[PDB]
Amino acid sequence: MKPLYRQLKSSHYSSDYSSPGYLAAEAVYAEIGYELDTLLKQNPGYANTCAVRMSLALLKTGISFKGRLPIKKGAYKGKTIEPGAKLLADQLHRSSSFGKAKIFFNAPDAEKGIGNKKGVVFFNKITNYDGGHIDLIEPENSLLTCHSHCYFNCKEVWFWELS
Amino acid sequence: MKPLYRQLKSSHYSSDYSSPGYLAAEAVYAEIGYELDTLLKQNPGYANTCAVRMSLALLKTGISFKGRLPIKKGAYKGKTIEPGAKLLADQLHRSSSFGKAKIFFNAPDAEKGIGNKKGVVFFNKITNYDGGHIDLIEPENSLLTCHSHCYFNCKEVWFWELS
Ligand SMILES: [K+]
Ligand SMILES: [K+]
Ligand SMILES: [K+]
């Protein structure tokens, strides 16, 4: 299936405190049956929660993707999360659900390429930020807004349009 | 013609430790295929990195200018950086894209002249600071802030407004 933007957004926990769809990182992991503090000790990379949040939104809208972190609690117990942003972007890139991303190498090209569309965005190799960022993006007041945060100071912007 | 402020900013590496867009001098030069240590030995002036950073931001927003350091690596290989702040300011001043800067000769006139606008700023002949400083400036909580640092304690402030 191909998820609709509105429903993917409804099913996506934002990390932005002022977002209507906000949920704290600890609560996101608790839902899937993990203690964040425990995971951080195993791999500090778990502090970057964008791909966990996006994985969960995709699962909730019925989208297939390979994952590495088993869900241990709730309706999605047994299903898997991909906690790495790049690895999740790779999955989307090779999927029939989403197809190949449009990839932009500078800010003007990224903004023009996205234009008035909405969908999934992946900011790859962000300046002064570890692990990248995958999120939802849409126009707002003639600018682009991300459900959590945009990171246009990066090496590559990947975009998948949704309806 | 002129680049959009937000896109120029997204394309600009800050030298402010606290900036979300911070990249250290070593990494800046490494991107364009240079070793900072080597350049410093050729000319200690290379320690002032503001014009290299601004040069990169201009290239990434498709703005043409005369430079003197050929890029050896990446998307802009073959094109030049201008490492000198005054010389870069000269190029913008005579360009058809940016046009003539508004030039202020004291700090209060500069503050009032820039006001609540945003764009490119050049601080010429800064007290107790060698090489000048070219940067991005914008209001934040009704106070002007530079992407790296402001230096209003100088002989001349040049300003190009951007949208
Ligand atoms: K955030
Ligand atoms: K996040
Ligand atoms: K050039």
Numbering used by the authors:
A (entry chain A), B (entry chain B): 1 to 163
Sentences from the paper on this structure:
Some Gram-negative bacteria target their competitors by exploiting the type VI secretion system to extrude toxic effector proteins. To prevent self-harm, these bacteria also produce highly specific immunity proteins that neutralize these antagonistic effectors. The opportunistic pathogen Serratia marcescens has recently been shown to utilize T6-dependent secretion of two family 4 amidases, Ssp1 and Ssp2, to mediate antibacterial activity. In S. marcescens, the resistance-associated proteins Rap1a and Rap2a neutralize Ssp1 and Ssp2, respectively.
Isomorphous crystal structures of Ssp1 (at 1.85 Å resolution) and the active-site Ssp1-C50A mutant (at 2.2 Å resolution) reveal the overall enzyme structure and details of the active site. The protein is a monomer in solution but crystallized with two molecules in the asymmetric unit, each consisting of residues 1–163. The primary, secondary and tertiary structure of Ssp1 classifies it into the NlpC/P60 cysteine peptidase superfamily. An N-terminal subdomain comprises residues 1–95 and is formed by six α-helices (α1–α6) and, on the surface of the protein, a β-hairpin-like loop (β1, turn, β2). A short peptide segment links α6 to β3, which represents the start of the C-­terminal subdomain. This subdomain is dominated by a four-stranded antiparallel β-sheet with order β3–β7–β4–β5, which is flanked on one side by α7 and β6 and on the other by α6. A disulfide bond is observed between Cys146 at the C-­terminal end of β6 and Cys150 located on the loop linking β6 to β7. A cleft, the substrate-binding site, is created between the subdomains by residues in the α1–α2 and α4–α5 links, the C-terminal segment of β6 and the loop leading to β7. Cys50 donates a hydrogen bond to a water molecule, which in turn interacts with His133, Asn48 and Tyr129. Asp135 accepts a hydrogen bond from His133 and appears to complete a catalytic triad reminiscent of that observed in typical cysteine peptidases. The differences evident from structural comparisons suggest that a distinctive and more open substrate-binding surface in Ssp1 compared with those observed in Tae4 structures or implied in Ssp2 might explain the promiscuous endopeptidase activity of Ssp1.
